[PDB]
Amino acid sequence: QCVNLTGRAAIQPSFTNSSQRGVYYPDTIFRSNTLVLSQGYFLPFYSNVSWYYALKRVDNPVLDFKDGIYFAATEKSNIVRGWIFGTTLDNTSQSLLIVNNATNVIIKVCNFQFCYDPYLSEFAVYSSYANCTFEYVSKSFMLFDTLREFVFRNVDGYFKIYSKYTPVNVNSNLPIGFSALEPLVEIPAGINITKFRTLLTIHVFSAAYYVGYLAPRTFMLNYNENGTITDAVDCA
Amino acid sequence: LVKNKCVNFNFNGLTGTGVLTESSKKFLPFQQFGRDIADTTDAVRD
Amino acid sequence: NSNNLDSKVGGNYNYLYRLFRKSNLKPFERDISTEIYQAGSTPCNGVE
Ligand SMILES: *[C@@H]1O[C@H](CO)[C@@H](O[C@@H]2O[C@H](CO)[C@@H](O)[C@H](O)[C@H]2NC(C)=O)[C@H](O)[C@H]1NC(C)=O
Ligand SMILES: *[C@@H]1O[C@H](CO)[C@@H](O[C@@H]2O[C@H](CO)[C@@H](O)[C@H](O)[C@H]2NC(C)=O)[C@H](O)[C@H]1NC(C)=O
Ligand SMILES: *[C@@H]1O[C@H](CO)[C@@H](O)[C@H](O)[C@H]1NC(C)=O
Ligand SMILES: *[C@@H]1O[C@H](CO)[C@@H](O)[C@H](O)[C@H]1NC(C)=O
Ligand SMILES: *[C@@H]1O[C@H](CO)[C@@H](O)[C@H](O)[C@H]1NC(C)=O
Ligand SMILES: *[C@@H]1O[C@H](CO)[C@@H](O)[C@H](O)[C@H]1NC(C)=O
Ligand SMILES: *[C@@H]1O[C@H](CO)[C@@H](O)[C@H](O)[C@H]1NC(C)=O
Ligand SMILES: *[C@@H]1O[C@H](CO)[C@@H](O)[C@H](O)[C@H]1NC(C)=O
């Protein structure tokens, strides 16, 4: 069943920047004491990022998955639960659903008839679904404040997710610093993805989520004795 | 595993000639091979 | 070749393929929709 949350405030994004955030491992090879130059799709340094709040105001708007998304979430109560990716977001096309319950994550690639306003509570997201090509069950991605960072990339029929989790202080703002995300999953989906919405639990407990867009750039990356990335330079 | 001699090792489909000694390097769960400055393999999980 | 298993005397019509699409597929991508392709102007609205 679907219901429309009447009584919210209009969605208005604030703005900040992603100072030296969102750098992921590009290879599965152990290098130490080396500096390498790499090409690819990266989140530009000091780039404009959008800010959304979930405090009687719920922000679940349709955004454009252009080339890859950097999604950061500051949360103490685990309000954010999952995402949906697709194009039409109707039953005329195939969509990807990633939802985290208390224990595990559930990934599904089917034809869903999403409701006009998706939110968890029950599971008031889709009226019905059919033709499920792919099903997955793993361990929860989301097992005072805690910063969770993800990178969603859609390449060559594979949905790739890189993640990192760090406990930060009560200053909900996106901390200024350096982060090095680590590979997490590769889902063989084989679909066309141009839009996505976020799934927010409503009881509303405070949470915040920031969105950034990947662009094609060259990066200089550094490796230490122990084999982990510790610094990077944006050449442009 | 004939050790400390000039042999052909063929570890997991990777072939070559060399000598094997223990190492203290620690690998992340998604890594098995390691390459040095000259890009040749030096560390192999056994 | 599988002309022994996939051929029936009356004919086998259970295998299908896509003939019309707006644009080329990308590598390892799948398309199982069944909308109505519109050759020209004057939209279809499912009339076929
Ligand atoms: C997607 O699912 C629908 C419904 O599950 C499938 O339609 C059914 O297909 C079977 C086998 O051809 C028929 O016996 C049923 O009568 C169909 N039902 C309806 C309501 O049409 C459809 O074939 C599936 N598509 C794909 C590509 O698997
Ligand atoms: C992925 O989906 C988008 C949107 O459905 C497709 O873009 C459309 O492409 C056709 C073909 O030229 C255009 O006529 C439409 O105007 C495009 N839509 C938009 C919103 O711009 C895109 O082609 C799909 N990708 C693939 C590989 O098929
Ligand atoms: C929510 O509102 C839309 C129109 O904005 C309407 O089409 C839809 O049916 C509503 N959802 C309900 C009544 O569950
Ligand atoms: C990025 O934001 C910080 C505040 O968080 C600001 O001090 C800094 O000047 C900004 N950088 C740019 C390039 O705008
Ligand atoms: C980010 O983009 C918005 C909208 O284009 C703009 O108002 C804002 O000033 C931008 N932020 C920076 C730091 O330029
Ligand atoms: C698919 O969506 C249409 C509305 O666009 C609806 O009428 C139809 O019943 C849906 N089909 C299924 C199987 O839910
Ligand atoms: C959560 O998801 C898992 C899927 O592994 C399922 O077994 C379980 O029943 C779900 N609910 C709870 C409360 O764990
Ligand atoms: C590598 O890890 C060890 C602990 O296992 C630590 O003592 C050492 O400082 C680390 N290397 C660097 C460069 O920090």
Coordinates of C-alpha atoms and ligand atoms in Angstrom, one line a residue:
Chain A
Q1 CA 0.0 0.0 0.0
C2 CA 1.1 3.6 -0.8
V3 CA 0.3 6.8 1.2
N4 CA 1.4 10.4 0.7
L5 CA 3.1 12.1 3.6
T6 CA 1.2 15.4 3.8
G7 CA 2.6 17.9 6.2
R8 CA 6.3 18.0 5.3
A9 CA 8.3 21.1 4.5
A10 CA 9.5 21.7 0.9
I11 CA 12.8 20.1 0.1
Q12 CA 15.6 22.8 -0.1
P13 CA 19.3 21.7 -0.4
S14 CA 22.1 23.5 1.4
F15 CA 25.6 23.4 0.1
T16 CA 29.2 22.6 1.2
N17 CA 32.2 21.1 -0.4
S18 CA 34.0 17.7 -0.5
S19 CA 37.5 18.7 0.5
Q20 CA 39.7 15.8 -0.3
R21 CA 36.9 13.2 0.2
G22 CA 36.1 10.1 -1.8
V23 CA 39.2 8.3 -3.2
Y24 CA 38.9 4.6 -3.8
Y25 CA 41.3 1.8 -4.5
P26 CA 41.7 1.3 -8.3
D27 CA 43.6 -2.1 -8.2
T28 CA 43.7 -5.3 -6.3
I29 CA 47.6 -5.5 -6.2
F30 CA 49.8 -4.9 -3.1
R31 CA 52.1 -1.9 -3.6
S32 CA 54.2 -0.4 -0.9
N33 CA 56.4 2.7 -0.7
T34 CA 55.3 3.8 -4.2
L35 CA 53.6 6.8 -5.8
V36 CA 51.4 6.1 -8.9
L37 CA 49.6 8.2 -11.4
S38 CA 46.1 7.1 -12.4
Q39 CA 43.3 8.0 -14.8
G40 CA 39.6 7.5 -14.2
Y41 CA 36.4 8.9 -12.7
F42 CA 37.0 10.6 -9.4
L43 CA 35.2 13.1 -7.2
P44 CA 37.0 16.4 -7.7
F45 CA 38.7 18.0 -4.7
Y46 CA 36.9 20.9 -3.1
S47 CA 33.8 20.1 -5.3
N48 CA 30.3 21.3 -4.8
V49 CA 28.1 18.8 -2.9
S50 CA 24.4 18.8 -2.1
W51 CA 23.1 18.6 1.5
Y52 CA 19.8 17.0 2.6
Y53 CA 18.2 16.9 6.0
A54 CA 15.9 14.3 7.6
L55 CA 14.7 15.8 10.9
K56 CA 8.8 16.9 10.1
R57 CA 10.8 17.3 6.8
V58 CA 11.7 14.2 4.8
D59 CA 14.0 14.6 1.7
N60 CA 13.5 11.8 -0.8
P61 CA 13.8 13.5 -4.2
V62 CA 14.7 12.0 -7.6
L63 CA 18.3 12.8 -8.4
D64 CA 20.3 12.1 -11.6
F65 CA 22.9 9.3 -11.5
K66 CA 25.1 10.8 -14.2
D67 CA 28.5 8.9 -14.1
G68 CA 28.9 7.8 -10.4
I69 CA 27.7 9.0 -7.0
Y70 CA 29.6 9.7 -3.8
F71 CA 27.0 9.4 -1.0
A72 CA 28.0 10.4 2.5
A73 CA 25.6 10.0 5.5
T74 CA 26.0 11.4 9.0
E75 CA 23.8 9.5 11.4
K76 CA 23.5 8.4 15.0
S77 CA 20.1 6.5 14.6
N78 CA 20.5 4.7 11.3
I79 CA 17.6 6.6 9.6
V80 CA 18.9 6.0 6.1
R81 CA 18.3 2.5 5.0
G82 CA 18.8 2.0 1.3
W83 CA 18.4 3.1 -2.3
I84 CA 16.6 2.5 -5.5
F85 CA 18.3 2.8 -8.9
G86 CA 16.7 2.8 -12.3
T87 CA 15.4 5.0 -15.2
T88 CA 11.6 5.2 -15.5
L89 CA 11.1 3.9 -11.9
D90 CA 7.9 2.2 -13.1
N91 CA 7.1 -1.4 -14.1
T92 CA 8.0 -0.7 -17.7
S93 CA 11.8 -1.0 -16.9
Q94 CA 14.1 -2.9 -14.6
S95 CA 15.2 -1.4 -11.3
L96 CA 17.7 -2.2 -8.5
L97 CA 16.7 -2.1 -4.9
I98 CA 19.2 -2.1 -2.0
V99 CA 17.5 -2.2 1.5
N100 CA 19.2 -2.8 4.9
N101 CA 17.1 -4.3 7.6
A102 CA 18.2 -4.9 11.2
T103 CA 20.5 -7.9 10.4
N104 CA 21.2 -8.2 6.6
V105 CA 21.0 -6.4 3.3
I106 CA 18.6 -7.3 0.5
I107 CA 19.5 -6.6 -3.2
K108 CA 16.9 -7.2 -5.9
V109 CA 16.8 -6.5 -9.7
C110 CA 13.1 -6.7 -10.7
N111 CA 10.3 -4.7 -12.4
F112 CA 8.8 -2.7 -9.5
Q113 CA 5.8 -0.4 -9.3
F114 CA 7.3 2.0 -6.9
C115 CA 4.9 4.2 -4.9
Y116 CA 4.8 8.0 -5.4
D117 CA 6.6 8.5 -2.1
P118 CA 8.9 5.6 -0.9
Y119 CA 9.7 5.3 2.8
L120 CA 10.2 2.6 5.4
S121 CA 8.4 2.5 8.7
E122 CA 6.2 -2.2 7.4
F123 CA 7.7 -1.8 3.8
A124 CA 5.6 0.8 2.0
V125 CA 7.8 1.1 -1.1
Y126 CA 6.3 -0.9 -4.0
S127 CA 2.8 -2.1 -4.7
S128 CA 4.0 -5.1 -6.6
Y129 CA 7.0 -6.6 -8.4
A130 CA 7.7 -9.2 -11.1
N131 CA 10.4 -10.9 -13.3
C132 CA 13.2 -10.9 -10.7
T133 CA 16.4 -11.7 -12.5
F134 CA 18.8 -11.3 -9.6
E135 CA 18.5 -11.9 -5.9
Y136 CA 21.2 -11.4 -3.2
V137 CA 21.4 -11.7 0.6
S138 CA 24.5 -10.7 2.5
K139 CA 25.4 -8.8 5.7
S140 CA 24.1 -5.3 6.6
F141 CA 26.1 -2.5 5.1
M142 CA 25.1 -0.5 8.1
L143 CA 25.9 -3.0 10.9
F144 CA 27.4 10.0 18.8
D145 CA 27.4 10.5 15.1
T146 CA 28.8 8.1 12.6
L147 CA 30.0 8.9 9.0
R148 CA 29.3 6.3 6.3
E149 CA 30.7 7.0 2.9
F150 CA 29.9 5.1 -0.3
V151 CA 30.7 5.3 -4.0
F152 CA 28.3 3.8 -6.5
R153 CA 29.7 3.2 -10.0
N154 CA 27.9 1.6 -13.0
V155 CA 30.4 0.1 -15.5
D156 CA 30.2 -2.7 -18.1
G157 CA 27.1 -4.4 -16.7
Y158 CA 28.4 -4.3 -13.1
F159 CA 27.2 -2.2 -10.2
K160 CA 30.3 -1.5 -8.1
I161 CA 30.1 -0.3 -4.5
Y162 CA 33.0 1.0 -2.4
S163 CA 32.5 1.9 1.3
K164 CA 34.1 3.3 4.4
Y165 CA 32.8 3.8 8.0
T166 CA 34.3 6.1 10.7
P167 CA 32.9 7.4 14.0
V168 CA 33.1 11.2 14.1
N169 CA 32.0 13.9 16.6
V170 CA 28.6 15.5 17.1
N171 CA 29.5 18.2 14.4
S172 CA 27.2 16.6 11.8
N173 CA 28.9 18.7 9.0
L174 CA 30.9 16.7 6.5
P175 CA 34.4 16.7 8.2
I176 CA 37.3 18.2 6.4
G177 CA 40.0 15.7 5.7
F178 CA 41.1 12.7 3.6
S179 CA 39.3 9.4 3.1
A180 CA 40.3 6.2 1.2
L181 CA 37.3 4.0 0.4
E182 CA 37.7 0.2 0.0
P183 CA 36.0 -2.1 -2.5
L184 CA 32.9 -3.7 -1.2
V185 CA 30.6 -5.4 -3.8
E186 CA 30.2 -6.0 -7.5
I187 CA 26.6 -6.9 -8.5
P188 CA 26.0 -8.2 -12.0
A189 CA 22.9 -6.3 -12.9
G190 CA 23.1 -5.3 -16.6
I191 CA 20.6 -2.4 -16.5
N192 CA 20.5 1.2 -17.4
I193 CA 20.7 3.6 -14.5
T194 CA 20.0 7.4 -14.7
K195 CA 18.1 8.2 -11.5
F196 CA 17.9 7.3 -7.8
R197 CA 16.0 7.9 -4.6
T198 CA 16.9 7.4 -1.0
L199 CA 15.0 5.4 1.5
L200 CA 14.5 7.0 4.9
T201 CA 12.9 5.5 8.0
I202 CA 10.3 7.6 9.7
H203 CA 9.2 7.2 13.4
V204 CA 11.8 12.2 13.1
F205 CA 15.3 11.3 14.3
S206 CA 18.0 13.6 13.0
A207 CA 20.2 12.5 10.0
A208 CA 22.0 14.2 7.2
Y209 CA 23.1 13.0 3.7
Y210 CA 25.4 14.6 1.2
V211 CA 25.6 13.9 -2.6
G212 CA 28.5 14.4 -5.0
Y213 CA 29.1 13.7 -8.7
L214 CA 32.1 11.9 -10.1
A215 CA 34.0 13.5 -13.1
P216 CA 36.8 12.2 -15.4
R217 CA 40.2 13.2 -14.0
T218 CA 43.8 12.2 -13.4
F219 CA 44.9 11.6 -9.8
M220 CA 48.3 11.1 -8.1
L221 CA 48.1 8.5 -5.3
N222 CA 50.5 7.6 -2.5
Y223 CA 51.2 4.2 -0.9
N224 CA 52.9 3.6 2.4
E225 CA 55.0 0.7 3.8
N226 CA 51.9 -1.2 4.9
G227 CA 50.2 -0.9 1.5
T228 CA 47.4 1.5 2.1
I229 CA 46.6 4.8 0.3
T230 CA 47.4 7.8 2.5
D231 CA 47.5 10.9 0.2
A232 CA 46.5 12.0 -3.2
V233 CA 46.8 15.0 -5.5
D234 CA 44.2 16.4 -8.0
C235 CA 46.3 17.4 -11.0
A236 CA 43.7 19.8 -12.5
Chain B
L1 CA 57.8 -27.3 -2.0
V2 CA 61.5 -27.7 -2.7
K3 CA 62.9 -24.7 -0.9
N4 CA 66.1 -22.6 -1.3
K5 CA 67.1 -23.6 -4.8
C6 CA 66.7 -22.5 -8.4
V7 CA 63.3 -24.0 -9.4
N8 CA 60.2 -23.4 -11.5
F9 CA 57.4 -22.6 -9.0
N10 CA 54.1 -22.4 -11.0
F11 CA 52.0 -20.9 -8.1
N12 CA 48.3 -20.8 -9.0
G13 CA 49.0 -20.6 -12.7
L14 CA 51.8 -18.0 -12.3
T15 CA 55.0 -19.6 -13.5
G16 CA 58.7 -18.6 -13.2
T17 CA 62.0 -19.4 -11.7
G18 CA 63.2 -18.3 -8.3
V19 CA 63.8 -18.9 -4.5
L20 CA 61.2 -18.8 -1.8
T21 CA 61.6 -17.3 1.7
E22 CA 59.1 -16.3 4.4
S23 CA 57.7 -12.7 4.6
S24 CA 56.0 -10.5 7.2
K25 CA 53.8 -8.7 4.6
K26 CA 50.1 -8.5 5.5
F27 CA 47.6 -8.6 2.6
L28 CA 44.0 -7.3 2.6
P29 CA 41.4 -10.1 2.0
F30 CA 41.1 -9.2 -1.7
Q31 CA 44.8 -9.4 -2.5
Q32 CA 47.1 -12.3 -3.4
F33 CA 50.0 -11.0 -5.5
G34 CA 52.4 -8.1 -4.8
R35 CA 54.5 -6.1 -7.2
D36 CA 57.6 -3.9 -6.5
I37 CA 59.2 -0.9 -8.1
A38 CA 60.2 -2.8 -11.3
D39 CA 56.6 -4.2 -11.4
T40 CA 57.6 -7.8 -11.0
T41 CA 56.0 -10.1 -8.5
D42 CA 57.7 -10.5 -5.2
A43 CA 55.1 -11.7 -2.7
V44 CA 52.7 -14.7 -3.2
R45 CA 50.2 -16.1 -0.8
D46 CA 50.7 -19.8 -0.4
Chain C
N1 CA 24.1 -27.1 -33.5
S2 CA 20.9 -28.2 -31.8
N3 CA 18.5 -29.1 -34.7
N4 CA 17.5 -32.3 -32.9
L5 CA 16.2 -30.6 -29.7
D6 CA 15.0 -27.2 -30.7
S7 CA 13.1 -28.1 -33.9
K8 CA 9.5 -29.4 -34.0
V9 CA 7.7 -30.9 -37.0
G10 CA 5.0 -28.2 -37.0
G11 CA 7.6 -25.5 -36.1
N12 CA 9.1 -24.1 -33.0
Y13 CA 8.1 -20.5 -32.2
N14 CA 9.2 -20.1 -28.6
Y15 CA 12.5 -18.3 -29.3
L16 CA 12.4 -14.5 -29.7
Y17 CA 14.6 -11.6 -30.6
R18 CA 14.4 -7.8 -30.6
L19 CA 14.1 -6.1 -34.0
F20 CA 13.6 -2.4 -33.2
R21 CA 15.4 -0.2 -30.7
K22 CA 16.0 3.5 -30.4
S23 CA 19.8 3.0 -29.8
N24 CA 22.5 0.5 -29.6
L25 CA 23.0 -1.7 -26.5
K26 CA 26.1 -1.3 -24.3
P27 CA 28.3 -4.2 -23.4
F28 CA 26.8 -6.9 -21.1
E29 CA 23.5 -5.0 -20.9
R30 CA 20.0 -6.5 -21.1
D31 CA 16.6 -5.2 -22.3
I32 CA 13.4 -7.2 -21.6
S33 CA 10.8 -4.4 -22.1
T34 CA 7.9 -4.8 -24.6
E35 CA 6.7 -1.3 -25.4
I36 CA 5.5 -0.3 -28.9
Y37 CA 8.2 1.0 -31.2
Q38 CA 7.2 4.3 -32.9
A39 CA 8.6 4.4 -36.5
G40 CA 7.7 8.0 -37.2
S41 CA 5.7 10.8 -35.7
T42 CA 2.1 10.6 -34.4
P43 CA 2.7 8.7 -31.1
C44 CA 1.4 5.2 -30.8
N45 CA -0.3 5.0 -27.4
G46 CA -0.2 1.2 -27.6
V47 CA -2.5 1.0 -30.7
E48 CA 0.0 -1.2 -32.7
Ligands
LIG1 C1 7.7 -11.7 -16.8 O1 6.7 -12.3 -15.9 C2 5.4 -12.5 -16.5 C3 4.4 -12.9 -15.4 O2 5.1 -13.7 -14.4 C4 5.5 -13.5 -17.6 O3 4.3 -13.6 -18.3 C5 3.8 -15.0 -18.2 O4 4.6 -15.9 -19.0 C6 4.2 -17.3 -18.9 C7 5.2 -18.0 -19.8 O5 5.3 -17.5 -21.1 C8 2.8 -17.4 -19.3 O6 2.4 -18.8 -19.2 C9 1.9 -16.6 -18.5 O7 0.5 -16.6 -19.0 C10 2.4 -15.1 -18.6 N1 1.5 -14.2 -17.8 C11 1.1 -13.0 -18.2 C12 0.2 -12.3 -17.2 O8 1.4 -12.6 -19.3 C13 6.6 -13.0 -18.6 O9 6.8 -14.0 -19.6 C14 7.9 -12.7 -17.9 N2 8.9 -12.2 -18.9 C15 10.1 -12.7 -19.0 C16 11.0 -12.0 -20.0 O10 10.5 -13.6 -18.2
LIG2 C1 19.4 4.7 -20.9 O1 18.2 5.4 -20.7 C2 18.1 6.7 -21.3 C3 16.8 7.2 -20.9 O2 15.7 6.3 -21.2 C4 18.3 6.6 -22.8 O3 18.4 7.9 -23.3 C5 17.4 8.1 -24.4 O4 18.0 7.7 -25.7 C6 17.1 7.9 -26.8 C7 17.8 7.5 -28.0 O5 18.6 8.5 -28.6 C8 16.7 9.4 -26.9 O6 15.8 9.6 -28.0 C9 16.0 9.8 -25.6 O7 15.7 11.2 -25.6 C10 17.0 9.5 -24.4 N1 16.4 9.9 -23.2 C11 16.8 11.0 -22.5 C12 16.0 11.2 -21.2 O8 17.7 11.8 -22.9 C13 19.6 5.8 -23.1 O9 19.7 5.6 -24.5 C14 19.6 4.5 -22.4 N2 20.9 3.8 -22.7 C15 21.1 2.8 -23.6 C16 22.4 2.3 -23.7 O10 20.1 2.4 -24.2
LIG3 C1 -0.2 10.7 -4.0 O1 -0.4 11.9 -4.8 C2 -0.4 11.6 -6.2 C3 -0.6 12.9 -6.9 O2 0.4 13.9 -6.5 C4 -1.5 10.6 -6.6 O3 -1.4 10.3 -8.0 C5 -1.3 9.3 -5.8 O4 -2.4 8.4 -6.0 C6 -1.3 9.6 -4.3 N1 -1.0 8.4 -3.5 C7 -2.0 7.8 -2.8 C8 -3.4 8.4 -2.9 O5 -1.8 6.8 -2.2
LIG4 C1 35.4 24.4 1.4 O1 34.5 24.5 2.5 C2 35.2 25.0 3.7 C3 34.3 25.0 4.8 O2 33.8 23.7 5.2 C4 35.8 26.4 3.4 O3 36.6 26.8 4.5 C5 36.7 26.3 2.2 O4 37.2 27.6 1.8 C6 35.9 25.7 1.0 N1 36.8 25.6 -0.2 C7 36.5 26.2 -1.4 C8 37.5 25.9 -2.5 O5 35.4 26.8 -1.5
LIG5 C1 27.0 25.0 -5.5 O1 26.0 25.1 -6.5 C2 24.9 26.0 -6.1 C3 23.9 26.0 -7.2 O2 24.5 26.1 -8.5 C4 25.4 27.4 -5.8 O3 24.4 28.2 -5.4 C5 26.5 27.3 -4.8 O4 27.1 28.6 -4.5 C6 27.6 26.4 -5.2 N1 28.6 26.3 -4.2 C7 29.9 26.8 -4.3 C8 30.8 26.6 -3.2 O5 30.2 27.4 -5.3
LIG6 C1 2.2 -1.9 -14.8 O1 1.9 -0.5 -14.6 C2 0.6 -0.1 -15.2 C3 0.6 1.4 -15.0 O2 1.5 2.1 -15.9 C4 -0.5 -0.8 -14.5 O3 -1.7 -0.4 -15.1 C5 -0.3 -2.3 -14.6 O4 -1.3 -3.0 -13.9 C6 1.1 -2.7 -14.1 N1 1.3 -4.1 -14.2 C7 1.6 -4.9 -13.2 C8 1.8 -6.4 -13.5 O5 1.6 -4.5 -12.0
LIG7 C1 16.2 -9.3 7.9 O1 16.8 -9.8 6.7 C2 17.1 -11.2 6.8 C3 17.7 -11.6 5.5 O2 19.0 -12.3 5.7 C4 15.9 -12.1 7.2 O3 16.3 -13.4 7.3 C5 15.3 -11.5 8.5 O4 14.1 -12.2 8.8 C6 15.0 -10.0 8.3 N1 14.4 -9.5 9.5 C7 15.0 -9.4 10.7 C8 14.3 -8.8 11.8 O5 16.2 -9.9 10.8
LIG8 C1 52.2 -0.3 9.8 O1 51.5 -1.1 10.8 C2 52.2 -1.2 12.0 C3 51.4 -2.1 12.9 O2 51.1 -3.3 12.3 C4 52.5 0.2 12.6 O3 53.2 0.1 13.8 C5 53.2 1.0 11.6 O4 53.4 2.4 12.1 C6 52.4 1.1 10.3 N1 53.2 1.9 9.3 C7 53.0 3.2 9.1 C8 53.8 3.8 8.0 O5 52.3 3.8 9.8

